[PDB]
Each structure stands twice: as C-alpha cells, then as structure tokens.
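Work package 3, deliverable 3.1, input record:
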Amino acid sequence: WXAXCPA
Amino acid sequence: WXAXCPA
Amino acid sequence: WXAXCPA
Amino acid sequence: WXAXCPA
Amino acid sequence: WXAXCPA
Amino acid sequence: TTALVCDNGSGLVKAGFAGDDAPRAVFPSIVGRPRHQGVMVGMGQKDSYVGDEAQSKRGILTLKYPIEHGIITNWDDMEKIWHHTFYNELRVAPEEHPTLLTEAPLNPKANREKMTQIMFETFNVPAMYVAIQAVLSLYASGRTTGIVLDSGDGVTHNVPIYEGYALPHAIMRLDLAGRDLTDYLMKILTERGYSFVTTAEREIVRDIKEKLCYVALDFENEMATAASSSSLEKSYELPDGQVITIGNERFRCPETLFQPSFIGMESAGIHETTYNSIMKCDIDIRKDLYANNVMSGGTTMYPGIADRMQKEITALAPSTMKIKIIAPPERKYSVWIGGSILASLSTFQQMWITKQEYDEAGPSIVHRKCF
Amino acid sequence: TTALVCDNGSGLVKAGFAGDDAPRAVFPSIVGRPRHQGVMVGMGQKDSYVGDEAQSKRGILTLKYPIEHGIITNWDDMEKIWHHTFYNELRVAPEEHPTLLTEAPLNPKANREKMTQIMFETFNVPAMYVAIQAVLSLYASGRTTGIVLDSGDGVTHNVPIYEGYALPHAIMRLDLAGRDLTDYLMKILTERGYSFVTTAEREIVRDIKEKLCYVALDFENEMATAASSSSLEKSYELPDGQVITIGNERFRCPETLFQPSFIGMESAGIHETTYNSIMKCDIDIRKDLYANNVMSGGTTMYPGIADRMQKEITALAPSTMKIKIIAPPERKYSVWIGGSILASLSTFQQMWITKQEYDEAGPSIVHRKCF
Amino acid sequence: TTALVCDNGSGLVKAGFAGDDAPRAVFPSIVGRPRHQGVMVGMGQKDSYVGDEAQSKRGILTLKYPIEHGIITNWDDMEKIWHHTFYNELRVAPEEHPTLLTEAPLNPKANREKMTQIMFETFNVPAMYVAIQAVLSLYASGRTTGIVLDSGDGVTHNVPIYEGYALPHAIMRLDLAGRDLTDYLMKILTERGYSFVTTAEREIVRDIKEKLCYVALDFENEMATAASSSSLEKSYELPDGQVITIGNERFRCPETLFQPSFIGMESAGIHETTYNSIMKCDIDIRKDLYANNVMSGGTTMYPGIADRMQKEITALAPSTMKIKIIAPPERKYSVWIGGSILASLSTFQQMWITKQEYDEAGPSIVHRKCF
Amino acid sequence: TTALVCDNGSGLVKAGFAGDDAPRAVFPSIVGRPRHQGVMVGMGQKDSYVGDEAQSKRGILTLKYPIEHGIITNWDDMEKIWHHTFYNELRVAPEEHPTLLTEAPLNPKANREKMTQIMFETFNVPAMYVAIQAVLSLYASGRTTGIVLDSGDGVTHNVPIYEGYALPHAIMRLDLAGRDLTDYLMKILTERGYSFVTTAEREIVRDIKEKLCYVALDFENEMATAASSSSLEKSYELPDGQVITIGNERFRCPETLFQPSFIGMESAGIHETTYNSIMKCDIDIRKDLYANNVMSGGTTMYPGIADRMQKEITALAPSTMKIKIIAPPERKYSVWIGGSILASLSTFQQMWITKQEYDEAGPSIVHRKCF
Amino acid sequence: TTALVCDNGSGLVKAGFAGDDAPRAVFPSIVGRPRHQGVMVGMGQKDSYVGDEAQSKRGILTLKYPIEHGIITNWDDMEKIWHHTFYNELRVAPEEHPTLLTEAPLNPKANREKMTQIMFETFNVPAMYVAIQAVLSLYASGRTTGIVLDSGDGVTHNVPIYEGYALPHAIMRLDLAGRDLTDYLMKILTERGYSFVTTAEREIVRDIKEKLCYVALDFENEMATAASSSSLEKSYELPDGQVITIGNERFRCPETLFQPSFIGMESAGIHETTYNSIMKCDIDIRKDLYANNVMSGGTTMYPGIADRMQKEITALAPSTMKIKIIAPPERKYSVWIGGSILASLSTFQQMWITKQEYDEAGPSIVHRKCF
Ligand SMILES: Nc1ncnc2c1ncn2[C@@H]1O[C@H](COP(=O)(O)OP(=O)(O)O)[C@@H](O)[C@H]1O
Ligand SMILES: Nc1ncnc2c1ncn2[C@@H]1O[C@H](COP(=O)(O)OP(=O)(O)O)[C@@H](O)[C@H]1O
Ligand SMILES: Nc1ncnc2c1ncn2[C@@H]1O[C@H](COP(=O)(O)OP(=O)(O)O)[C@@H](O)[C@H]1O
Ligand SMILES: Nc1ncnc2c1ncn2[C@@H]1O[C@H](COP(=O)(O)OP(=O)(O)O)[C@@H](O)[C@H]1O
Ligand SMILES: Nc1ncnc2c1ncn2[C@@H]1O[C@H](COP(=O)(O)OP(=O)(O)O)[C@@H](O)[C@H]1O
Ligand SMILES: [Mg+2]
Ligand SMILES: [Mg+2]
Ligand SMILES: [Mg+2]
Ligand SMILES: [Mg+2]
Ligand SMILES: [Mg+2]
C-alpha cells in the first residue's frame, strides 16, 4: 500500500 | 337529547 | 390516499 | 442492543 | 547457534 | 346605557352592542384541548383554547363544539366560551348591563333553565332575555309577516309569523343542518380520493364547502353535465400546499338539503318542510306567507339556493301565487342584526327579566315572562 | 362451472374455488426485490418474488405491500401478485371462469375502476363482482342481521346490517389496523431493548405478535401485575437462535385498539366506534344489533378480545341489553368463507358483471350494477 | 448555586456550567488501554487513558468507545469518563450541585436506569435530569416550533415539535451516523490505495473527513467532474509526514447520508426520513414545520449540507412551500448550548429529580418525573 | 476453444485449462537474482530465475515475491512470472484464448488497472476477467450460500454470500496470513535455538511449518502438556543433514491465527472476524450462514483447524445453531477448481471483457463490466 | 547495600557498582591458553589467562572468545571470566549482593537458563536480573521514547520503545557487528599487502581499526578521492616497530555496515534495518521515533557515523521529519551506565529474582519474572 502496511 | 339524536 | 394518510 | 445492531 | 551461524 | 347582543348558537358566536349595525366579535364556538405531551418547559401554554386560538392551533388541539343541534351539552365549555366572548373579545364587563341571548325553537326546557341561571350566577347579568332566532330575522328584514327559514350549523327551523302572532303549531324543526352537510361532504370526498378524519381536517372541509359549493337548479342534468365536463371541476389549495380538485361533489353536497335521504334522514326536504308549515296555516293567510319567504343563516349563502327554493315551492304551490324568496345580502347575520334592532327598541325594555324577578320566582320564570 | 373467490385485501391473500370450505392459497401480499449485487453467475434468480418466496428470502429482499390501508397503490406489483395467485398457487386459468373480489367500504373510486379494468384486460375474466367484506362475513355466519366488525391488516370497519338493508350512513372506517399495531410494537420493543428496523425484521415482529400477544380485561391492573411479576413474561426464539423475553408489551400492544391515542390516532377506540355506529341506527333496530355483534378478521384472534369488547360495550350500552359478541373459531377466514357461500348461491348469478356489459358501459358500471 | 451541563453522547463529551455560553471541557469519549508489554520500570504509566490522553498516545493504546449508537455498553469505562470529566476536566465536585444529562430518543430503558443510579450512587449527585437532545437544540435556536435534526456520531434523529407539544409518534431514529461514515470512508480509501485498520488509524481517518469532505449538490455530475479533473483532488499530510491525495472520495463519503444503501443500510435517506416525519404530522402544522427545519450536531458541518437538504426537501415537498434550512454557525454545540439555557431557566427548577424522590420511588422514577 | 485459469495470488501460482480438474502448473511466485560474482565463464546462467528454478538454486539467489499481501508491487517481476507461466509451464500461447485472473477483495484500484492493461498489451489476451477468489471457492463447493474463508499466503478474507447476492458491506479483509505465520515462526525458532535469516532459510522454515505444525483445541493445556512431555517434540532434517527438534513451537505458530496480538496485530482473531461478518448480516440469513462455513486456501490445511474453528464459533454463536465447518480434501486448490468450473460454464461467456471493449472504454472498464 | 552491574556481552567486560558513574573493570572477554611447550622450570605460569593477561602475552597464547554473536558457547571459559571479574578485578565477593546481567534480545533460551543457574550455583548470588541492553541505553540517555541502536562486537540490534512499552514485534537483530568488521578488514589488508592471521594479529588489527577508521558521507567520491591522493593515507606503527600505511581501507571497512553485502551478508544495511523497525510501528508514533534515534555501543564511535546515519535515514524517511541522531560522548559505555542507574533505582528493587524464588520455580522463572 501507501499508507499503513509497506505494500 | 336523551332519546333520538345523541344530543 | 392523496390527502390525509400517505396512501 | 440485543437484537438487530450489535449494541 | 545450531543452525544458520556457527554459534 | 346599552345591552349586549349575541348569537350564541351553533357554529359561530356573534356579538356586539345594541345599536351596532354589525357584530364585532365573530368567531367559532370551539373549545380546544391539547392531545400531545407538552415538552418545552417555558412554552407558556394553556389547557384550553377558544375560537381563533383553536383554529390557529387546530393541528394540536382536539376541538369540540359545546353546542350540538342547538343544544348546549358541555356546560363547562359553554361557560368558557362566554367568558372569552365577554372579556377577550368584547372587552366588557357584562355585569354592567343586560344581555340578549337567542335560541332555536323547541329545545329541551333545561337548556333554558341553565342558561338563565348561569347568566345570573356566573356573570351576574343585570337583565336578560331569550329570543327565538327566527323572530329576530324578521326584525332584521323590517317585516311583520313572513316565514322565516333559519338554517344554521346545528339546526334548521321554520317559523311562520303573521303580523306578529307567531303560529306555534306550525313551527318546524329540522336537524339537518350545515354541520351535517360538512360531515356528509367528508364521506363524499373519500369517494373522490381524499381522506379527512381529524377534527382539524373537518374544519378544513368546512372551509372548502364555504368556498366552492353551489346549488344546482337541475341536479339531474347537473350530474349529466359533470359526468362529461371538467368545466365544473375546480381546484383548491390545502394548508400544506397540496392541491385538490373537486368534481361533482361541488353541488352534490348542497343537494342534501333537498334530499335528506342522502344521509339517512327520513325527514322531508327543506322545501317540503317549508311548504308543510304553510299548509298548517289557515287559508286566509297562506297567500301572504307565500309572498314573504325569508332566508336567514349561513346555509342560505350557497349560490343559487334562493332560486332553487323558488323553483321547488313554485312546483308545490298553486299556480299564480307570488312566490318570493327574500334573500338579501348579509342574511348570514340576520339574527344578530335583528337582535340589535330589538334591543335598541325602547318599547322592548319591559320584556327584560330582572334579577329581582329571578330571585323571587326562580329560573322557571323564563317560561312565563319570556317567550 | 365454478368461480374464483379471493380475499385480495391487505396482509394475506386468500383464494380458492366457490363451494370450497377453505381457501387453499394462503400467502402474504408481498413483493420482494433484491437490494444487493448478485454475484454468482448461474444463480438462476429473479428480480421479483412473491408471498412465500418473499418470506423465504426476506433477508435479501426489500419487501413491499402493494396494498396500504385497503388501497392499491402499486398496481404493477398488484398485478404480479394476482398473476402468481392464479397460476402458481391456484394452478388455474382465470380466463375460464368468474371471479369474486372484495374490498373495504369507502375506498377511492379509482381503486375499483382499475381493479375492474385489469380483470378485463390483463386477465380477461368472464365475469366479476366486487363485494364488501363485511357483508360477506354475515354470509359466513349465516345471519341477516348484525354488525360486522372486520378488522384486518390495513383497515378496520363497521357495517350494520338489518335483514340485509345495510345502513350506509352508519358505516365506519378506521385506519388503525393490524399493520399499525405491528409498527407500534416495534417501537415498544425498542424500550424493552430490542431493535427491529429492516422490513424483514418487521415481519419477524409480526410473527411475535401473532403468538404472544393477548388482550387484558383490565389494562390498568394488568400493568400493575406485570410491574411485579415474571409470570407475565414470556420467552421467544428469534430466527438466528437468539432468545428474547417479552414483558408487559405482550398486552400493551393489543390495548392500542381500545386506546388509539397511543399512536397519535385521534379517533375513538374500536368499541366506541362500534357503539357509535349503533347510535346512528334507529332505536327500533338497535336492540337486535346489540344481540348480534360479529367479529371478523385476523385481529379478532387475540385471546380475550371478545371479552374485552363485551365489557366495553356493556359499559357504554343501556342496562339489561343482550350484548353478545359472536366470535367463532375460524373467524380469521370469515370473509373468504362467505365469498364461497355467496358464489355458490345460484340466485347470486344475476349479479355478475359481464364483459359484454363492460364493453358497452365502460368501467363506470362498477358503480351501478355492482354495489 | 449552579448546575453541570453536559453532552454525554457518542463521539465527544461536552461539559460546562449552566449560564456558560460555551462548554469548556471538550474531548473524545474514548478509553484507552495499552496492548504492549511495558518495559521501562519507572515509566509512571497507567492502565487506562481518557480523551486527550488517549489521542496523544493512540499508537500504543487500544481505543474504545463505551457508547455505541447512543447506547452505553461498557459501564465501567463510562464511569471512568465521567470521573475524568468531573475532576480532571471541570475541576469540580459534582456532589455539590445538579447535573443535566442528555440522550437520543428511543433508547433501551435500562440505559436510563443505570445512568440514573450511577449519578446517585457513584457521584451522589444532588439532582438530575435527562433530556432529549433534539429538544435542547430548539432552546438553543430560541424557537418553540420546528423539526430538529440531530445528527451526531452514533445516532441521527428527528423530533418534530410544535410550540412544545412534541409529537412522539413522529420521532425518527436512524443508526446511520458519523461513526459509520468514518468506517465507510476507510473502505473507500482502500480503493484509492491507502490502508487504515488500527483503531488509531480510524481516528486519523476521522480527522481527514472533518477537514476535506464536502457535500455535492449534484452527486452524479460531481462524479462526472471528478473523473476528469484534478481540481477536486486535494492533498493531506499524515502524522508521519506522508502525503496522501484524496480524489472523488472527498464527496462520496458524505453522499451516504442521502443514500444509506451504500453501506447496506436498507433505511431511507436522511431527507426522506425528515420528510416522512413531517408526513406523520397533521396537515395543519406541516406548513410551519417546513418553515423551521433545524440542523444540529457535528455531521451538519459538511459544507453544502444545508443546501443539499434544501434541494432534496424542495423536491419532495409541495410547491410554493417555504423550505428553510436553519443552520447557524456553532450548530455543532447546539445541544450543549440549549442545555445551558434550560438549566439557567428558573422555571425549569421544578423538573429536577431529587435524591429524596429517588430513594422513595426507585430508579423507575426516571420514566415518570422525567420526560 | 478453451480458456486459461490461474491463481495468480501470493505464495504459489496455479494454472491449467478450463475443464481440467486440477492445475498442472503449480509453482512458487518467486523471482530470483544472484548476489554473488559469477566466475566460471561458460556457466550458461541467467540474471533471473522463476519458481522451481528459484527454489533449486535458492542458496545463491536473492528471492523476492512480486506480490505482497495480495498486491502486486514489482510489476516487472510480475510480468516475468506470467511469462514463465504461459510459455515454460503451460506451454501455450495465451494470445490464442481468454484468461481468468483472480484477486482478493478490497485491493487498491490500480492493481486491477495494470493487470488488465498488461494482459492486453504484453500478452494481447483475447479476453479476460477478474474474479474474487472467495466466490470461486463456492463454485468449487457447488453451493450458492455460505461464508467463504480464503486464507492464503499474503491475505485472508471473508465473503458472505447468500444465493449469490454477495454482501459487500460484510466483507472482511485480514492481513494476517501464512507469510506472516512463517515470519513469526522464524522468531520463535530463535528462542528454541535455531537461526534462520536468509531468504533461502525463510523458505526452509516454510517447509517445516507445512509438515509439522498443527492446531490445538486447547492451547492453554496444550502448552501445559508440552512443558512436561517429549511426546509433542518432533525431529526434522534440514537440507545439509542437520537434525533439529521442534518443541511447543509446533502448535504455537498456528495459534497466532486465533490470537493475532502475538505479532502486534491489533485485529481480532480469525474466528472473531468470521463471526463479525455474520453479525453484519440480517438476522434472516444468519442461520444459513452458520450452516455453511467454507474453508479455503493453504492455511486451512493445518490438522485440526476445522475443529478449532468449530469450537470457537460455537462459543460465540447462540446455542442450538448448526455450526458446520465445511473443509473438504483438496480445499487447498478450491479457488483454482472453482475457476475451472466457472470458465467451463457456458452462461459465463457473456462476462468476458473483450479487447474491443477495452479499446473503446479504456482500462476503467474493469470497474464496470467486471465485478 | 549495593549491587554489581556488568556488561557481560561480547568484546569487553564492563563492571562496577550501582551508583558508580563509570565501570572500573574494563577488560577483554578473552581466555588464553599456551600453545607451546613450557620449558623453564620455575617460570610460575598458568594454563589460563584472562583479559589483560591475555593481551599482554598474546604472542604465546591462543585466544578465544567464550561469547560469539552474543551467545555464550564456552561455558567453562565463561565461568572463568566471571571468576576473574569478581575477584581479581572488582575485588569483591559477589555472594554478598545482587547482580545485574545483560543481553541482546532474541537469544536462544538456554543461554539465559545457564546464566541464571551459574549465578545461583557457582557464585551463589543473592539476587539477579537479566536486562535487555537496548533498554538500558535509554536509561542512560534519560529518555522514555526512542530507538536504540546497540551495536557491539558480536551483535547489533534495534529496539523501538515508546514511553516504555517496548514493541517486541519490531525488534531487529543483526549479526553484522564489530568482530565481523575486524575480520573483513584483515582480508582487505591482504590486498594492501599485509598479512595478519594469528589470533594475536587479529587483535592488532582491531587496534588499528579503532584508531584509524572513519565513516565517509559519500563512499563513492571518497574512493574517487583516495584513488588520487595520499592525504587519505595514514601511517601506523606495529608492535615490532614496523610501520604500515593504510590507504582507502581506512573508510572501506566502516562502509560494510551500510553495505553488508561486502561480506556476503544478504541482510539489509544498518540504516535500512533501523528504518524498517520504524516501519513496523504504528504511524502515530513513528514521528517521535524519528526524533529520538539513539546510538549506543563501540561501533558508534567511528567519526562521522552519526552523520552518515542521519543522511541515510533522511533519504529513506518522508520529508520535513526531524531526523535526529542522538550520539553523546561516552555512548560506548551507555549500557553499563544505564545499568548503574536502573540498579540504583529503588522502585526497581521489586524486579529482583531471589534464590528463594529460583528454588521453588526453577530456572524457568527467568522467562516469567524477568523480562
Ligand atoms: N359563506 C358561506 N357559504 C356557505 N355556507 C356557509 C358560509 N358561511 C357559513 N356557512 C355555514 O353555515 C354555518 C354557520 O352559519 P351560521 O348561520 O352563523 O350558523 P349559526 O347561525 O348556527 O351560527 C356553518 O355550517 C357554515 O359552514
Ligand atoms: N393468529 C393471529 N393472531 C393475531 N393477529 C393475527 C393472527 N393472524 C393474523 N393476525 C394479524 O391480522 C392481520 C392479517 O389478518 P387478515 O384478516 O387476513 O388481514 P386481511 O383480512 O386484511 O387479510 C395481520 O396484521 C396479522 O398479523
Ligand atoms: N468539523 C466537522 N466536520 C464534519 N464532521 C464533523 C466535524 N466535527 C465533528 N464531526 C463529526 O461529527 C461527530 C461528532 O459530532 P458531535 O455532534 O459532537 O457528535 P455527538 O453529538 O454525538 O457528540 C463525529 O462523527 C465527527 O467526526
Ligand atoms: N500443506 C500445507 N500445510 C499448511 N500450510 C500450508 C500448506 N501448503 C501451503 N501452506 C501455506 O499456505 C500458503 C500457500 O497456500 P495458497 O492458498 O496456495 O496460498 P495462495 O492461495 O495465496 O496461493 C503458504 O503460506 C503456505 O506455506
Ligand atoms: N574507539 C573505538 N572506535 C571504534 N570501534 C571501537 C572502539 N572501541 C571499540 N570498538 C569496537 O566496538 C566493539 C567493542 O565495543 P563494545 O560496545 O564494548 O562491545 P560490547 O558492547 O559488545 O562490549 C569492538 O568490536 C571494538 O573494536
Ligand atoms: Mg343561527
Ligand atoms: Mg380482511
Ligand atoms: Mg449529539
Ligand atoms: Mg489464495
Ligand atoms: Mg554491548
């Protein structure tokens, strides 16, 4: 992703 | 009234 | 209906 | 609540 | 250790 | 130096002073009580509303009419209305001077008894008199001979009078009145597709009636026309902005007066009753009575009602009779006007029932000193 | 060789053939549409469900009642229900033979107009007739004189009948009906601590009502008892296995019929309405009417309702009157049964409206050939 | 000599003294507990944090809301918040003087029962009163007639009031509220490409919503515009310095209030509910209610929400009606303000429930002395 | 004449042809690059290895997963895997016929966008469709109603479906998945006395997990037993011949799914999430959902996991509910199987997105034609 | 009345008394055994040397480190060192009072088990406690929030702490440490033209490193400079008087921490590991962690290492973040200092493990009473 997780 | 009608 | 109630 | 919702 | 490294 | 005159009958309350050419207090004989839980503390409200107050907030209030068919039933509320009338509307202490009250003929005795007493006990009125409304209508017309048709909210009646000398055996009383027409109309509207059931809604219906309804001179062909033409249809805006359209109901309601059977009212039509009263009079005066038929009261305001009466009577009556329906503008206030006249009459003065007399004879005096 | 008979009123649809002693098609007048995105391709589903289908999958479907207060509002859905009724339930082509439809008294004219037309246009029904439900109840009872109280889902009404000769001016119509009681109960349950808001949940509540609620003969002391005793409390299992317990709501809901004011319903209580209808009848027949009060419809199934009516009327009525509440088993199907009877009656045959007549006169014939 | 006034509802806790024109204690109704092993001995920490403490250290704490949908569920934590409120925030011993508590209409009875008891047992409060929040909003507006729309964090509701005399049968309650919008937004952001799942992250999302979201007056074309223009896009900086950009989600979230179906909420849109409440009122007062619609609560702060309501109602309502959406600055504190007013009202004094009365009647008094 | 079906999710890549009852290409979604200086000229090596190549030479290669938590992050490598899949494994030119791709619900929009485009641009695939994996699991089971629990390598999710009509508002997504369990286990082993830190070593750990770990039905007493008995201990041979012995870690790792907090995962346990999804569904269908819980994906292969789920749900659910955990052999391939089924379905054909449509609408079509 | 505090980690042994501001015993954790035939009778020698003895005669002795990568491997020798520490260095009988031991996080369980036991059995220590070194570093800094980077001889690790509440799931452990750098340097020197292979020679290399090496802020251009300038070259005198000259190796060795791949260490660079630990923390606290990065341990003594860390993190982190590298003088003794502080803390007292408790619970108590 672009927020919580690191994806 | 007290007879025919409801007055 | 079309007046009092919503029918 | 104790029925619909979870309150 | 007993696996990777040699400790 | 003067006297109070009022129409304390069903429907509306009319009041003013003797010598006035118009009542100043004109408002509904309605008492209202709230039927919902008051919440906002400090709202500054009451448990009882009267007349315009009642109309103003009728969506909340349960509205009642103390008077039904010309009979006072809820005396507590009756008292309240009079209270309001005297102090809030007329702005006058009735204790100071005499009052003229009115009624329809043939009411249960007790009705008069309590009226009299209240005037003397609650209001402590100096003097009073109860008059038959029909009679007053003649004073308004300035005639001594004729047949008065007083058709109000709760009661319709006929009183044939010949140079005074009213003929009691020929007085007719008919329950079918404006309030019933209102109720009937409500049912008719259901057919059309509108529902009115709350008391407030009843009042709305009344408003409609008073604006749109009219009398046909040929009910049968009036319907034939209605059935094929929107020209009879007419729109109307309800309080919340909704628009309704009235069809043939616009004249079907009025028709009931000529055909009481529509509401199960076994009794003869209003024109038959009129006629019959004449039939109960001696042949010598019948002619004169045909000449002076006098309309009176709010229901005689429907457009064309005079013409319809004329036609109907003409049919029932012998040929070459001068059937004249007297139906002047302002006939809605006829009675009240007559009251003003009568009260201003100086001769009349000796008809007042004084408190002195009341104390000595008791309330039964109303059946002896007063007609 | 026969005819279809059905109760196409609010709530449930009842249907069967003339001469049958019970309807075979008995299912909810409900149309359901999905409100979620269908995903599984091949699911084999439809965009419209009816009756049992609707109940079966009510957690997905948005359920509607085409009929509200005895008035058909959603004609498309109405049509669908009838379609279902004839082909899926009854398994019969209606085009082959006559159909008896019913309604509550005092409905907007147009309601009949469209019903008639649809029967002739969509279904092409050979002949038809619209009857007042109350009347049918008497046929079920086998009596010619009495007062029928038909209290269904969307509407309650009173029709006094005296050896036939129904008295139209005394017919009462009350909006307060089972559907409203259901809705009210939902709000009460909130107080208790249960929330029901979806349409499906509404139906659950209905189920509860039909099983647990009963009528008290002393509402005031019933509450006094409830307030100090679990003996009135009763458990119930919801569809997902949860168990709930009902307290005083078990009788508070039913009470509304006697005190409409609970839901803001200005109108008089059901027993007052009953009484008033009698008051609108001539003294000569009032006695007989007191003797035959007839219950009818699903809401008259609450345990003790008969006794409560009896008590209430007894109080309002003159002494030494034979107040009898007729309330036989199976009164829930009264109307339908009566329909079967009437339809089987050979004399009745001449009341059918034929297509021939329809074509010539138009849909307005329903207001002339049919009562 | 005074009294405490507070908004103990969902979301935030507002509190101050009667006569104050603004609450001084304004902080989240959140209780936090650590979910990691404390290591540094001497850290001087606690096992429970409240309000700002919770926000300050939300990356460590598990945050909970004792109140869900206007219902107190975690009483222990509830107590803690009140404790904090009185001593840490207000810096006052509540035992000294009366307290006004508030609630949404239609809550499980027990909610009131325990509130009452706690106030008397834990806090030993001299006197207390529970008020409906909607009512208080009118006091803030200074009006006696209108429809209050109180749309907070856990619950939205409608209470039509006409010169006081609230109409209970027309009160609407809607679960769809700010907290749900927050949750929904989280899912939408996933689409955009951002993940928020921890409770702390939930709070971040809330912050975003409160700053960037707005109401469209044409959702359909708003999307059409968004789909082809970065002018609707807007950046925002997260706590760790990352910058995110919001697209059409900026107005899609707010839209849910008008189309609840987005979250599976079967219920009608907020403007339909509003309208329906009016429909449950008698035609006589409907006009006035259209004139005074009153916004109230944090969700009515979205830019353009007033205009959207206006438009929607205008469409549903009859023509030529004065649809006015009252939506003053500071409407976010409406209720609290109203509370200050009401409490300062001297007349109100006689509505307080005293401990004396409590002891004698028990907690059930809250359903009789207090509305 | 056919179509490609593949599970392009995290972990492993499954692929075969529509109508096949098993995937033929089954290999790791891993890309490897060397991290040492190549010396022997003529070695004939490459700068990129895929799947089995990567496993075979993992001691040299740096291994990466293009897919993280169900999100494609390294598109270049993603492309390479697909390339390998089609030509090296399946031995087929994808350009010839349609392909079914799958994904977990709630992924960043862009993920779909690029997938779509690549299929059309790099591979020039005739037609394509993206399906939610959970849905496919039901097709494999042959059921239209149930809750699918798809718990793979990078992501776990719950999708409640009721005769199709998936309920999007109740879909749950959980990051905690097999890859995390693997990582966690590595840390646990450190405690035991074994160090694994290279990517290759990570893969070894995965192997261990898949062979030795099992689910306890009483974690607490399972530990009590472990603490005093070598009967739970079990040996295992590492690639270089060393033998290790696993103690209580054999069941401690699996436990994490029920207690996510072990890795700092604030989120509720897998059985709580399951339950909560049910709670978000209407009471009418909850029963059915309890009846059909469907396991799916590699993590549901731990011995006893079904029983543990059963127990946990049983505890949370109401009594007398038929809690059934459907967990058939071969559930590891559920999704792929379902894909084969769906693709073979002829009705399905009309769901394909054609290149024609793509060209006209653009990649955004995936959010409109495809669910 | 006091307690012993020591850093029994790899490399050097630090020891002193609680309350002391500096360790007094500072010497190498080295055990030496002779590897040549002793000849001179009467030499008065031993078969085992420790610390300074070992350094003093390292040309004869075979030197070993009992501790490797933070793990005690040679327990016999370990015991000997402690023996020496207590009696030869500290000159104190440990049996008299409590001892604080330390360790790196994530060590094989057995390491603690034996430590505990030995303290109770060989030394019969009154009370003991094992602490994580990183934690102690914060006590030295006087902060409750930050990320401690403890980079010693055998192990480097990262422990993020937020007002205590250490986050175990974010703890990183890296084998790459000072001892490895030493070894690497030896190989580099071979390139330069110097051979070091004996253990004694290894120690010489260590000395060199500690004096000459420094960290470049631009490794690439640092090499570019070195390649054309003797200004980076620097001489050094070996024990036998030979002079050597170091070229670019002076900064190439340090670089390894940022590029572990130089020694085949697959793992990410020290700044990436640092960063990643932060990434494993919730967004709410990440900001604070960036603010307090704390250096600790001997390897953080290379000139410029702080600046290099700053630069590297700055690059990886979001803009406008306050990246602060806390790196105070005397950070080489951080841990020991922290130990002194913690031990002097009176509150801490209740964390001691007593012999009583040990006897009752067994050595496993170290995993329950002690963190
Ligand atoms: N303008 C009008 N047109 C038709 N009917 C009217 C009109 N005004 C009043 N009415 C009806 O006449 C009755 C009231 O008139 P009124 O004669 O004052 O009654 P009352 O004499 O008994 O007070 C009501 O039923 C009212 O609706
Ligand atoms: N056994 C029952 N007990 C109580 N109320 C019932 C029962 N069955 C039905 N009802 C209520 O009566 C209504 C349906 O009865 P019915 O008379 O068939 O309505 P309708 O005649 O309008 O179809 C519904 O509101 C229903 O809940
Ligand atoms: N400035 C704002 N703009 C939009 N929404 C807001 C704003 N402030 C608060 N909210 C939302 O309104 C709710 C809190 O408002 P409030 O009315 O105080 O709730 P409550 O009355 O239940 O305390 C929360 O869901 C909050 O996010
Ligand atoms: N036999 C097994 N037993 C236990 N866990 C397994 C087994 N096989 C695979 N797994 C775990 O499940 C995941 C891969 O399964 P799979 O469902 O194919 O993932 P995905 O569906 O995301 O490809 C990996 O984390 C793997 O280690
Ligand atoms: N002044 C220094 N400059 C650079 N590196 C040093 C210095 N002193 C010690 N070191 C290196 O740091 C390590 C020892 O430091 P220390 O932190 O005490 O290790 P430990 O904490 O594991 O005892 C050894 O590898 C040593 O060579
Ligand atoms: Mg009159
Ligand atoms: Mg019925
Ligand atoms: Mg609020
Ligand atoms: Mg999968
Ligand atoms: Mg150290």
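Chain D is about 0% helix and 0% strand.
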